């Protein structure tokens, strides 16, 4: 049987920004700070605050506020880099900073003749090619950039085989270390997706079942 030999990849972005907390984790974190204070053992910062104003009361009867005030105003000096470049953009699907707290997945339109399918990015392999090397060749081919990704092993992650000439489709999983993703406004249709638009952009059974090996968290 003539097998239409197809390799692919599922690209991952690790979130540089941590996730926000649950409100139950808020009450638990506040509780752990209270009970953490309750079992501490005479920090010198309060020894330079509590007994010092006692001794000043003894001197007046016969600076920690400046340190806290300088720390407060210097806390007001450096503004934080905002964790949300996510709702202001809201349509920069091609951009790598679409989300910061979740994982982001590369996802590319392909126009065929018998089909016209929005596909998790593929490649075509040769029996001489290594499958890991098929995915390595898949990296710097379709995006046309200078990224830096990272694989883990020659183990695959998700396999789906469709016919109409036999075929098979192999899904690996890579991981972006860094990216010199030059000219992000490409003519290609790469779209970064958290989890939820993968069930929006990808309807069929060979594509509505990718999320069961996407690291959902």
């Amino acid at each position: 049987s003539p097998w239409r030999l197809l390799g692919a990849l599922c690209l991952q972005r690790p979130p540089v920004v941590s996730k926000p907390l649950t409100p139950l984790q808020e009450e638990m974190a506040s509780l752990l700070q209270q009970i953490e204070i309750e079992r501490s053992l005479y920090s010198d910062h309060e020894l330079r605050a509590l007994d010092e104003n006692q001794r000043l009361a003894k001197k007046k009867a016969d600076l920690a506020q400046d340190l806290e005030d300088m720390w407060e105003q210097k806390f007001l000096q450096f503004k934080l880099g905002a964790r949300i470049t996510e709702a202001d953009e809201k349509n920069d699907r091609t951009s790598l900073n679409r989300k910061l707290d979740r994982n982001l997945v590369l996802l590319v339109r392909e126009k065929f003749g018998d089909q016209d399918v929005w596909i998790l990015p593929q490649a075509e392999w040769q029996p001489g090619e290594t499958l890991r090397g098929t995915a390595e060749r898949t990296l710097a081919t379709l995006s046309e950039n200078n990224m830096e990704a990272k694989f883990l092993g020659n183990a695959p992650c998700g396999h789906y085989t469709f016919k109409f000439l036999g075929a098979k489709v192999f899904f690996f999983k890579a991981l972006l270390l860094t990216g010199d993703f030059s000219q992000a406004g490409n003519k290609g249709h790469h779209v970064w997706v958290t989890k939820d638009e993968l069930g929006d952009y990808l309807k069929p059974k060979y594509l509505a079942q990718v999320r069961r090996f996407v690291s959902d968290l």
Binding site: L24, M28, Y42, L47, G81, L131, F151, A155, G158
Partner: protein
């Protein structure tokens, strides 16, 4: 060399008199109890989630290696082969503010 840093510093002995006072109320320990109870609920639901993910993804990759075995008997021998790029493998933890 067996030098560790679990040895306690000597200054934490003498002035231990700042907080001898630990008193609470009834409803404070009630809400503390509800945080421990519902927080063990929350954490248990979390490891149910992660155990579901390891089960799902592990069976996904085993089914994948079975199909790759039965559709290419010279590629499942090399799918098991390990990479020498995973000796110095690193990843730093996440942050808050992007550079």
């Amino acid at each position: 060399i067996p030098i560790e840093d679990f040895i306690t510093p000597l200054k934490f002995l003498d002035k231990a008199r700042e907080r001898p006072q630990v008193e609470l109320t009834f409803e404070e320990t009630e809400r503390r109890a509800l945080l421990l109870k519902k927080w063990s609920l929350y954490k248990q639901q979390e490891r149910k989630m992660e155990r579901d993910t390891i089960r799902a993804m592990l069976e996904a990759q085993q089914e994948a290696l079975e199909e790759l075995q039965l559709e290419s008997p010279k590629l499942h021998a090399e799918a098991i082969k390990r990479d020498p790029n995973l000796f110095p493998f690193e990843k730093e933890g996440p942050h808050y503010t992007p550079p």
